[PDB]
Design a protein around this ligand. Sequence first.
Ligand SMILES: CCCC[C@H](CC(=O)[C@H](CCCC)NC(=O)[C@@H](NC(=O)[C@@H](NC(C)=O)[C@@H](C)O)[C@@H](C)CC)C(=O)N[C@@H](CCC(N)=O)C(=O)N[C@@H](CCCNC(=N)N)C(N)=O
Lengths: 99, 99
Amino acid sequence: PQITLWKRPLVTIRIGGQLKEALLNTGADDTVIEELNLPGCWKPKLIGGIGGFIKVRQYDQIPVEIAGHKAIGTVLVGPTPVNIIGRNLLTQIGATLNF
Amino acid sequence: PQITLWKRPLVTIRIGGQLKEALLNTGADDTVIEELNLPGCWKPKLIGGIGGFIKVRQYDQIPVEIAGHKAIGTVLVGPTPVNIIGRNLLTQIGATLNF
Ligand SMILES: CCCC[C@H](CC(=O)[C@H](CCCC)NC(=O)[C@@H](NC(=O)[C@@H](NC(C)=O)[C@@H](C)O)[C@@H](C)CC)C(=O)N[C@@H](CCC(N)=O)C(=O)N[C@@H](CCCNC(=N)N)C(N)=O
């Protein structure tokens, strides 16, 4: 679809067998999801931005569907206000910025 | 232009008659630039990111040229790790996300 930027670009995703809303975020290298008990081997990571850093659990090769488009990759799990879909998954769905 | 997301969507902007590099950021409500000089009064504001909240200077109705495209809007100045063009100016240049 085409997603305008008048409001936050929130879409539905499916991850770990749960449906969630997430922000399509061209300013995020990685994908960060709210606290969720995903199965799998996870390892520690710190990620940063405005305000500093938070500790997250990194999971690899996690299947994620974004608005009906399948992706598979790394998801970081931690205490975020908004689920964030980053470029690692946005490229897999062929998302572009256009103007 | 159409911009893919294999690399960070960094572009050159012109602001207060000087050139800066910044990230086209659909995950940002607002436009935030590292410490730099702009004319006019500013208002103190707080904004939030992944790591917490920072204090910024809010400048209104600032002309900014983004990849050749003219916008006139609010620019926040403060200790962001990456200069970011957020939705307040992306909507002005008619940017959308597409997949
Ligand atoms: C969880 C909040 C949304 C997330 C985005 C993330 C973002 O824009 C930044 C942009 C680059 C760094 C400055 N990206 C990030 O912070 C991401 N960082 C990165 O991609 C990289 N790290 C760094 C240091 O660049 C890699 C190397 O890890 C991080 C999510 C890990 C993948 C962000 O910080 N948005 C802010 C930007 C500032 C702004 N004012 O626009 C925002 O919209 N803030 C709202 C928050 C509203 C919350 N309040 C509420 N809803 N009631 C606001 N107006 O303050």
